[PDB]
Design a protein around this ligand. Structure first.
Ligand SMILES: C[C@]12CC[C@H](O)CC1=CC[C@@H]1[C@@H]2CC[C@]2(C)C(=O)CC[C@@H]12
Ligand SMILES: C[C@]12CC[C@H](O)CC1=CC[C@@H]1[C@@H]2CC[C@]2(C)C(=O)CC[C@@H]12
Lengths: 126, 125
């Protein structure tokens, strides 16, 4: 029951759909109970739905964060995928933009076992 | 020198696509570390070392085109990710393929690791 290549594209795309509208509950629910997240990748892994939950509450909390797939979801045959997307929020008062790429591995239940988001300052624009 | 910086990674990964675009097999292989390990597509057995990597590219690269479809995303541990598209002819059928490459550079600016994320759902005409 590992998500197939097509199911991966669906789940990853849906994940962005939830971030764009700020459904913290639905996002957290997409993760495995013991899922880890590295955001930004390079940082120490944050483990557990509670810790991952806080993560989204604080970053999306303002309510004015948008997110959208900037390209197709590239999927593997082993329950993994990677996707390109942009995030629009506010920075220093003026509206900026962030280019990000998320690598995700799903457990045999269609839940995100691992998530890794690549991006740094070089990906921030005004 | 140490781990390529974020801006160095964006540059190196873009350089890699241009070598793939022109098809300079030999220049690509010079980008990889002696002990570089490549998984392409991801979920497939790794390709190990120069000789194999070179064998890999000569086979797949030697009418193929590659270009970035968006900016390279770079972190601060010599890693990055990038969205691109490969153009090719598969049995006479002009095709396209969306791919995302994840790479890790060593203390010397070479590619120690690479994972190519893609499958048939990313194939087109
Ligand atoms: C969670 C999310 C958006 C959802 C992505 O999968 C991961 C991620 C990366 C950086 C975060 C962003 C939300 C908006 C944030 C919090 C900002 O405003 C700056 C850093 C941004
Ligand atoms: C190596 C390369 C192109 C260089 C990329 O970094 C990785 C990759 C992914 C799929 C490959 C492609 C070359 C062209 C191939 C071999 C095809 O014709 C179908 C699959 C394609």
């Amino acid at each position: 029951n590992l998500p197939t290549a097509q199911e991966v594209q669906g789940l990853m795309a849906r994940y962005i759909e939830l971030v764009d509208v700020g459904d913290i509950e639905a996002i957290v629910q997409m993760y495995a109970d013991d899922a880890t997240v590295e955001n930004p990748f390079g940082q120490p892994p944050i483990h557990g739905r509670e810790q991952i939950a806080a993560f989204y509450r604080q970053g999306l909390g303002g309510g004015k964060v948008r997110a959208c797939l900037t390209g197709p979801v590239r999927a593997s045959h082993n329950g993994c995928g990677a996707m390109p997307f942009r995030v629009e929020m506010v920075w220093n008062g003026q509206p900026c933009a962030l280019d990000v790429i998320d690598v995700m591995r799903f457990d045999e239940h269609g839940r995100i076992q691992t998530m890794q988001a690549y991006w740094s300052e070089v990906n921030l624009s005004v």
